[PDB]
């Protein structure tokens, strides 16, 4: 039976709450997307279907465009390929933006696909399009979305009959926009852009009560508090590592609105954020926008090359809880995890283990991640003892962020029992 409902918020449209008390950890919903595609970056890198990496891929034959790590998921991805399949060869030489491969596959699952089980709560037709909010700027984007769409698909429609009835793309667009998640990996890089509606209810808030996790494409909804009957549901829509300055930004420009909260009104946190000497932080920051793009194409030994003359710079330094280097110290160590710089990795992931359980407060996936990214590399070099206390850490995180259902907890499991039976 559900733990959740929908309902009618006072100020904040359509959202989700408890039907039963709930308790850290308990899964609320899972849901696989109603459409889902593989992120501009990722394209190439990681498999289409499963969003997993691999030493190299077999592309599609029949496009040569979308690529599998396997025969089984190239098959198995075949049904919701295949409109697109001809689309993207036609398009052939040009590659679309994520939204618009988004929407192509939104509405040949519509037309063409059974009803989605991610739709049980909230369906594509009910999502928020904030149209009314909408400024001339973006009206501008969007209706430049509308004519690129029109015509990548132009080979699989031509008229509204192949639209759902009074389907409205400009609406469409509207609605991706403000409903669209990106979907990570394990290893919390970005893979994957989808839309999930019955998940889609969920408000934000910048100290949320529940939290998504993927495991491939499937979304796992959990509590990370204790929530009361009749409490509404929210999740944070945003990186952690933002001032308010910056969470208003986006929350204004992405989603149409103007938070609350209370770390919004204080200004939570946004002092030791920015700590360190300006000019330098505002450099890095500046610098952190090639290396960000770097890494969403996977180029680690440039990400490297870029982290280090600003981590062992021979001008000045910022500290490790200032977010601009932290965020550098995060990519450094991921470029080094992936370049087989273990003992660099570890110098990196180690540092930032204070400002993430002062950024990452109580239960998030994203630090149960990154203590099992730290308590791993400890592990393979055999700082058995340190590593023991990280893999149970990430554990007591994990167990509430990820749960039984995450493949992940399986793996934490694993090095637990490998780490365990090495030293105790
Ligand atoms: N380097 C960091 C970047 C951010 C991610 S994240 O896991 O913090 N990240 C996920 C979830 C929150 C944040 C930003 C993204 N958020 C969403 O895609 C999203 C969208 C929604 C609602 C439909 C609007 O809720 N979450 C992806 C960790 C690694
Ligand atoms: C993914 S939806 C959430 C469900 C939405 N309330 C609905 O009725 O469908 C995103 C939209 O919900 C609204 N929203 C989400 N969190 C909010 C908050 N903390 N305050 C005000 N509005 C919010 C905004 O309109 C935002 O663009
Ligand atoms: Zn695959
Ligand atoms: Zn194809
Ligand atoms: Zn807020």
């Given at each position: 039976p559900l733990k959740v409902e929908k309902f009618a918020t006072a100020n904040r449209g359509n959202g989700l709450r408890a039907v039963t008390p709930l308790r850290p950890g308990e899964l609320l919903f899972r849901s696989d997307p109603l459409a889902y595609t593989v992120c501009k970056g990722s394209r190439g890198v990681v498999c289409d279907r499963c969003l997993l990496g691999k030493e190299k891929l077999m592309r599609c034959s029949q496009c040569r465009v979308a690529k599998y790590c396997s025969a089984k998921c190239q098959k198995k991805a075949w049904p919701d390929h295949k409109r697109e399949c001809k689309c993207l060869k036609s398009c052939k030489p040009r590659y679309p933006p994520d939204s618009v491969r988004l929407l192509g596959r939104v509405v040949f699952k519509l037309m063409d696909?059974?009803?989605?089980?991610?739709?049980?709560?909230?369906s594509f037709y009910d999502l928020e399009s904030n149209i009314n909010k909408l400024t001339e700027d973006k009206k501008e984007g969007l209706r430049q979305l509308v004519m690129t769409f029109q015509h990548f698909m132009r080979e699989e429609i031509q008229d509204a009959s192949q639209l759902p009835p009074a389907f409205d793309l400009f609406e469409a667009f509207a609605k991706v926009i403000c409903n669209s998640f990106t979907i990570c990996n394990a290893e919390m890089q970005e893979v994957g852009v989808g839309l999930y509606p019955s998940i889609s209810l969920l408000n934000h808030s910048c100290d949320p009560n529940c939290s998504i996790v993927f495991n491939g494409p499937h979304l796992l909804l959990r509590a990370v508090r204790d929530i009361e009957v009749g409490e509404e549901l929210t999740i944070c829509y945003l990186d952690m590592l933002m001032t308010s300055e910056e969470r208003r930004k986006q929350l204004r420009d992405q989603y149409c609105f103007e938070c609350d909260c209370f770390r919004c009104q204080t200004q939570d946190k946004d002092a030791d954020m920015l700590t360190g000497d300006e000019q330098v932080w505002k450099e890095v920051q500046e610098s952190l926008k090639k290396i960000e793009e770097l890494k969403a194409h996977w180029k680690w030994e440039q990400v490297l090359a870029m982290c280090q003359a600003i981590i062992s710079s021979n001008s000045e330094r910022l500290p490790d809880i200032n977010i601009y280097q932290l965020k550098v110290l995060d990519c450094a160590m991921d470029a080094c995890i992936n370049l087989g710089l273990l003992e660099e990795a570890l110098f990196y992931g180690t540092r930032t283990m204070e400002p993430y359980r002062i950024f990452f407060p109580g239960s998030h996936p994203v630090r149960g991640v990154q203590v099992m990214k730290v308590g791993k590399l400890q592990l393979h070099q055999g700082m058995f003892p340190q590593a023991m206390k990280n893999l149970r850490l990430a554990f007591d995180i994990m167990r509430v962020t990820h749960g039984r259902e995450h493949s992940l907890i399986e793996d934490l499991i694993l090095l637990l029992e490998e780490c365990d039976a090495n030293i105790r």
């Open positions: 696909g059974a009803p989605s089980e991610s739709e049980k709560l909230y």
